[PDB]
Amino acid sequence: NCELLATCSALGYLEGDTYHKEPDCLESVKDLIRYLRHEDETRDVRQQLGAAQILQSDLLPILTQHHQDKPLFDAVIRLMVNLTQPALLCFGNLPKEPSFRHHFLQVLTYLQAYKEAFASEKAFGVLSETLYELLQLGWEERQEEDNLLIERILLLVRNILHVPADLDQEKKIDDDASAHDQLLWAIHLSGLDDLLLFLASSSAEEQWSLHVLEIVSLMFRDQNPEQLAGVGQGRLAQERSADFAELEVLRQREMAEKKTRALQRGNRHSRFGGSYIVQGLKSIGERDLIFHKGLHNLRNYSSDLGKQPKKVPKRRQAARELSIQRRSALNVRLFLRDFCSEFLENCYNRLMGSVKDHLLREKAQQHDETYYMWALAFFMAFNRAASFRPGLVSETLSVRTFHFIEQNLTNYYEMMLTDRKEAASWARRMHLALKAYQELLATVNEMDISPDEAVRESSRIIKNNIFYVMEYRELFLALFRKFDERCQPRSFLRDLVETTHLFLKMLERFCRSRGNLVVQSEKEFNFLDYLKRFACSTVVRAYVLLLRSYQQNSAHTNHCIVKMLHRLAHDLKMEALLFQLSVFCLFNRLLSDPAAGAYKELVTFAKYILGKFFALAAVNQKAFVELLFWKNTAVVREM
């Protein structure tokens, strides 16, 4: 510790706003790099230098005020890349035991401190200036001296963008400048964003395509494409009025719930006694039920009034969504909208072609196709949002991208089912693949709507290819029949249901418009026998699982759920599959909802199926027993 303190002191000192470097900075920095290279597996030197805050106190001032001293600048850049190395790379994984996890948290804390320090525009200004005067030279004029410096500069930017938000300070409310927002603003004011656009659009500097893709991914980490595309000049009044209206809506909901609870309990204090015998209700024994919880509770009596819920065991605990969404700063949102627009118009086709070339040549790291699929989803969604132009994404519209995404999704599906010790990670990768697939399937619909007969022709071509090949049809059933709430989040379930709805919409409209009978060595096909594959218990079980959150679901998601269930019930006559006790409890909640008028479609469907059930029950009383279990072909025996 003390030897590190000595070298850290030997770096120099700050005075007011000017840093006075010692002449032995070079050897002291080399010694620091040597200590970091000879670290323990606990990363003790990492923790100690982070605690000493030399990155904030010495290296940033040296970088910002002595950037003409090129050997010292290069040494400082290498040292800063080493220090800003992400914790997952430092330790290899998230440790499973307390001591290494404490060390991981320490390194992560100091990384968050570095990210806080790096929001200064001066540092990114120096980085942009040195990268600019480097890239001014021709590619053939570069040597290892400059190519390695480009690598270290871009890796420093990547490392600083990668850092997770502190759990302490991630409680920022919407429309506020988080640390990531301030960092993006630093990039914007320094002009490194324009250098990233240049690197993406350059044919000569295509060697950095994977790096630039990772920078752009970490830049647009938090954003949503349609929400970002909706940003514009008049947003302040819109968002202010929306905030006031949403505040009043929340308040009215809370007042309604308070009034309902005040009615459920009486207007007498709890120690006001009184006991009743409910003569008809047998207790757990043969004696009549004695009720003690007040007369007010017997209007909506239930036996679970006083019961403690059960501990879901660790294995059965459902997966939860990893982050809340927050509306970032308006300046940063405008900057990211402009970045995304200019990038889409000037850079996107060449960058995606370069990344696909890298993946084909197999000179990319293990999971860089996840970044490729992210970029597909984000930028095609942004393109369709606002002024849709398929020329801006025509490199992505090929059937080869459908094939690549389908292969990746099936690979992630297999690896999720087999590599069980990181099944959640494989599920997240599969979620990225699913969103990319969804955006392709949405883009062909937008091509159909668009007026150009050329894009309509190619839309017909790709639709014919996809609906002809079997895997695109079978993948949805494959996903539904092995989806697990234990592993995959409800956001994934939402995306799967909406993608299935869109896919069946397109397929039904296609077959309705024209026959096109042969499919898959070909065989005949029809959409009704395809839909009969969705009559399995598991898929409808997943659909009602998503339906349980109808209060929190989006209106489009609720429409997708109810339309699929209405297709299975009304058009395929499979109401006995959906005659279930848990589903009936959900219908009971739907009918008892005070906001049931807001869910007119759902309650109407519920009353339709309930009326069918009670007709069957009046005809035959064994339907009550049939409610208790999921079923296979009892769906026809009941009929």
Partner: protein, 36 residues
């Protein structure tokens, strides 16, 4: 039954045909026009 063959081969043509699009990549320009 030959309508089945006609449909199959016409669909084969309609999937083997190339993807005509308004593909375009805009003007190349040096880093000065980007940065400043």
């Amino acid at each position: 039954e030959a309508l089945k063959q006609l449909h199959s081969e016409t669909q084969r043509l309609i999937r083997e045909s190339a993807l005509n699009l308004p593909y375009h990549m805009p003007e190349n320009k040096t880093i000065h026009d980007f940065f400043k």
